[PDB]
């Protein structure tokens, strides 16, 4: 079934714009959505097929206090995305309240696309955590979608924000987003501003314009995470299939990222694999261990080599895995696209469930716990107090996220077979 992407908030809209543009050039599409004359791919899932042959994306664009939504409109690609579905604070509470009054018109825009498509498998949100308007509005829309579509699944390309710690309420906003995300999202793929900023400092000298350049980094991961679906293959020919192996237990659904040629700008499979397990290739910042690992490779890969490449990674014992029941590294192969450069003829990505990401969640919980005692930034803005007089959703969120922090470390232990 076709995937509908609910890109929301200024930050989320910017990564969402970069992702559709990335699949514009990668696929046979021009800036006016017209089939390219120069042009073997499954474009049905991501791109609606129009009567003018415009490959309109199934993308929902939500604007709040719009500034970067106006810049998106003055672009050569304005015609490419024309489902004609764009509808008009820095606080999580401020975003949640604004979303509630306009919920029905934004929700009808969701319906239109659902009716238009032959079918709708899942919702993929370019969400921004502690995103000012992006968070709060995104949590609320996350709660409505599951109730209306119980059968359908929700994924979130959360750009978890770590900038070395401006938002003084950033921990409070993030705390609330996760509670909704832990109980109302089937999958989540985690990214980190600092981890990518550190990569940007590593691969390039770019430091001050970190947000503009890092977009491209987020994009390469986001196009890549879907390439097995966007191009046909013998296995993983549906979104849920990739999502099943990566998230074993319903509560623990946060996925780490990595890319072998971060500098993609021959290499044997045996090599692109080990390069990935190394921690410079990772883009995320008591014993600790992965729960299950998966990898996808797109290039000139001897199909025969992968049958022995898995054994090669097994001998180096580079990775420590889960201890209760069985789990294993999974090897997958896809086709690099023609037209665009074939540099780094072999180039890979990995999506993995790792207990280290618990540490990033605890750091915002640490900032919040410190901030909660001080009550330095309760906002006490009438919106904040009137929306939350008890201020007990933050405590409800604190216990829910602490259960998650606990559940992760329980995973490390030998008895997750017992309740965790």
């Amino acid at each position: 079934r076709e995937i509908i992407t609910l890109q929301l908030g200024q930050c989320g809209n910017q990564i969402g714009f970069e992702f559709w543009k990335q699949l514009c050039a990668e696929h046979g599409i021009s800036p006016e959505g017209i089939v390219e004359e120069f042009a073997t791919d499954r474009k049905d899932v991501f791109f609606y097929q129009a009567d003018d042959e415009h490959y309109i994306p199934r993308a929902v664009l939500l604007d709040l206090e719009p500034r970067v939504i106006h810049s998106i409109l003055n672009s050569p690609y304005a015609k490419l995305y024309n489902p004609e579905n764009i509808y008009l604070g820095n606080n999580w509470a401020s975003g949640f309240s604004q979303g509630e009054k306009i919920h029905e018109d934004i929700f009808d825009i969701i319906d239109r696309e659902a009716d238009g498509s032959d079918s709708l498998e899942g919702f993929v949100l370019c969400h921004s955590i502690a995103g000012g308007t992006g968070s709060g509005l995104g949590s609320y829309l996350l709660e409505r979608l599951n109730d209306r579509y119980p059968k359908k699944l929700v994924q979130t390309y959360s750009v978890f924000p770590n900038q070395d710690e401006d938002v003084v309420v950033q921990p409070y906003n993030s705390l609330l987003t996760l509670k909704r995300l832990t109980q109302n999202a089937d999958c989540v793929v985690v990214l980190d501003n600092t981890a990518l900023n550190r990569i940007a400092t590593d691969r390039l000298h770019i430091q001050n314009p970190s947000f503009s350049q890092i977009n491209q980094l987020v994009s390469t991961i986001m196009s890549a995470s879907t390439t097995t679906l966007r191009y046909p293959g013998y296995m993983n020919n549906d979104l849920i299939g990739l999502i099943a192996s990566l998230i074993p237990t319903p509560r623990l659904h946060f996925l780490m990222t990595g890319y072998t040629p971060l500098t993609t700008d021959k290499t044997t499979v045996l090599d692109v694999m080990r390069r990935l397990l190394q921690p410079k290739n990772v883009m995320v910042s008591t014993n600790h261990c992965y729960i299950a690992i998966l990898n996808i490779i797109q290039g000139e890969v001897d199909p025969t080599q992968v049958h022995k490449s898995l054994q090669r990674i097994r001998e180096r014992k580079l990775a420590n895995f889960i201890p209760w029941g069985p789990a294993s590294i999974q090897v997958a192969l896809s086709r690099k696209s023609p037209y665009l450069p074939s540099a780094h003829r072999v180039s890979g990505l990995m999506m993995a469930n790792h207990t280290s990401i618990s540490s990033l969640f605890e750091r915002t919980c640490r900032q919040y716990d410190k901030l909660r005692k001080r009550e330095a930034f309760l906002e006490q803005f009438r919106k904040e107090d009137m929306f939350k007089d008890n201020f007990d959703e933050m405590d409800t969120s604190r216990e829910i996220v602490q259960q998650l922090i606990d559940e992760y470390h329980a995973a490390t232990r030998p008895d997750y077979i017992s309740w965790g």
Binding site: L270, K308, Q311, R312, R314, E315, R316
Partner: protein
């Protein structure tokens, strides 16, 4: 020669320890798939991943080891043997007779490399530490490191330059078969593999060396986790070593690249004159 005469030791440093934890186990308890994957991996890891025929090496076992040669349960450094694959074209020069002996050369040369690093490992653990050990370990190490500088730089690279030279100036394939068997018999005989009693005295020296490192490492582990047990072993081991070291030089002085061994083993006149035989 890259895998049989150990010119590429880069590969051996990486391969040795990566398989050793398995090698220390005895036979019938060792899985050829595990060793095969480990060598297959080590070969990719080494800087020697540029040779076209690298795939040929295969891990096989030598039954009875040097005993079959004119315990079997013992394995690891003990039962390791490489084997190389050749098709009909060049099989006619590099054959069973040729590769039975290249392997038999590599095997003896493996122990000298393996037990030199076991003596090196016991010296790392020690880094109050009575010197009883430091006297005997300095004796064995300076004796062996010198056997391996004689074997690799007094016999092998010498004769191999004879083979590469004469195979450049043959004009027939019954004369190339002459040089190939000529180089191989020369390196086998000039080296101590060719002795009437086959230098079992060298084997007895290597048995006391391994027994020394075993207990010495075990004791240093035991004391961490005093001389009535340690210095007792130190004195007896040093006394048996000095006896066999002198027996080796004495039974090698009877022969007359002949004395370049003993003249070197006592370089700067150490133990050069101790006891004149008879």
């Amino acid at each position: 020669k890259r895998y049989f005469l150990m010119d590429q030791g880069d590969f051996f440093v990486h391969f040795m320890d990566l398989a050793e934890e398995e090698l220390r186990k005895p036979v019938e308890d060792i899985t050829p798939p595990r060793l095969e994957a480990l060598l297959e991996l080590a070969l990719r890891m080494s800087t020697a991943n540029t040779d076209p025929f690298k795939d040929d090496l295969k891990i096989d076992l030598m039954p009875h080891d040097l005993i079959t040669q004119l315990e079997l349960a013992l394995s690891g450094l003990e039962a390791f043997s490489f084997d190389y694959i050749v098709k009909w074209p060049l099989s006619l020069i590099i054959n069973r007779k040729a590769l039975t002996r290249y392997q038999m050369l590599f095997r003896h040369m493996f122990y000298c490399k393996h037990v030199e690093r076991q003596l090196c490992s016991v010296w790392i653990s020690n880094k109050q530490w009575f010197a009883g050990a430091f006297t005997l370990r300095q004796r064995m190490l300076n004796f062996v490191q010198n056997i391996q500088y004689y074997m690799m730089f007094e016999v092998m690279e010498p004769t191999w330059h004879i083979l590469e030279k004469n195979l450049k100036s043959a004009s027939n394939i019954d004369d190339v078969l002459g040089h190939h068997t000529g180089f191989l018999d020369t390196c086998l005989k000039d080296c101590m593999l060719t002795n009437p009693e086959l230098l079992k005295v060298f084997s007895k020296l290597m048995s006391v060396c391994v027994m020394f490192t075993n207990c010495m490492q075990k004791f240093t582990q035991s004391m961490k986790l005093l001389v009535s047990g340690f210095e007792a072993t130190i004195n007896k081991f040093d006394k048996n070593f000095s006896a066999h070291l002198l027996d080796l030089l004495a039974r090698l002085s009877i022969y007359s690249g002949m004395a370049s061994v003993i003249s070197r083993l006592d370089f700067n006149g150490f133990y050069t004159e101790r006891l004149e035989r008879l």
